[PDB]
Structure 1
Amino acid sequence: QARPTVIRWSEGGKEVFISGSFNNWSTKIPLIKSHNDFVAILDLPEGEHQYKFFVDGQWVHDPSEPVVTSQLGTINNLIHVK
């Protein structure tokens, strides 16, 4: 079922969390600092998920990864899990 999937945040900051449609935005999951990156490993089902980062107190998307407009009218990242 779920696919362990490495998420990487490379834009810098001190504290980085992730949330998304994968858990119906029900909480924030910490990413862990690794050199100039922050990383987490999420078990995501197959298919598309929207997600966004909470980085030093602000919601921000990864500019290197695809984006969509959510039903709130906000910009989220989009990932396709094979």
Structure 2
Amino acid sequence: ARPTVFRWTGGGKEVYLSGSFNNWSKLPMTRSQNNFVAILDLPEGEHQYKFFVDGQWTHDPSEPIVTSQLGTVNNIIQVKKTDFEVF
């Protein structure tokens, strides 16, 4: 697994990260420079995720998106060879 950084820049007071990599639980993100950050060690390959921002599910319009099998919109990124790449 590679260290991988998620950064929410869309504002809010309290933000959780939810994704395929945590079985769609809600990881509290750390407030940092007016943004929210979380760092996970993730295997190389595809990951879907979304944000829970002040009680509302939201995706990041600046990362790629895909429609899940549930009929919902997730972000989709690919972890590659770069420690601490930011998504």
Q: TM-score, normalised by structure 2?
A: 0.88
Overall identity of the aligned pairs, in %:
79
- The residue type paired with residue 16 of structure 2 is F
The residue that corresponds to 1:76 in the other structure is 74
Runs of at least 4 residues off by over 2 Å: none
Q: Return the alpha-carbon distance in structure 2 between the equivalents of residues 75 and 58 of structure 1.
A: 13
Q: Return the alpha-carbon distance in structure 2 between the equivalents of residues 79 and 52 of structure 1.
A: 11
CA RMSD of aligned residues (A): 0.8
The residue that corresponds to 1:30 in the other structure is 28
The residue that corresponds to 2:20 in the other structure is 21
State the Cα deviation string for residues 6-57 of structure 1 (Å, max 9, x = none). Answer: 10000000000011111221x2111111122110101111100110100000
Higher RCO (Cα < 8 Å, 6 or more apart) = 2
- The answer to whether residue 41 in structure 2 is matched with residue 43 in structure 1 is yes
The residue that corresponds to 2:10 in the other structure is 11
SS of residue in 2 equivalent to 1:22 = helix
Aligned pairs, number: 80
SS of residue in 1 equivalent to 2:21 = helix
- The residue type paired with residue 58 of structure 1 is Q
Q: Return the alpha-carbon distance in structure 2 between the equivalents of residues 24 and 9 of structure 1.
A: 19
The residue that corresponds to 2:50 in the other structure is 52
Q: Return the alpha-carbon distance in structure 2 between the equivalents of residues 57 and 22 of structure 1.
A: 21
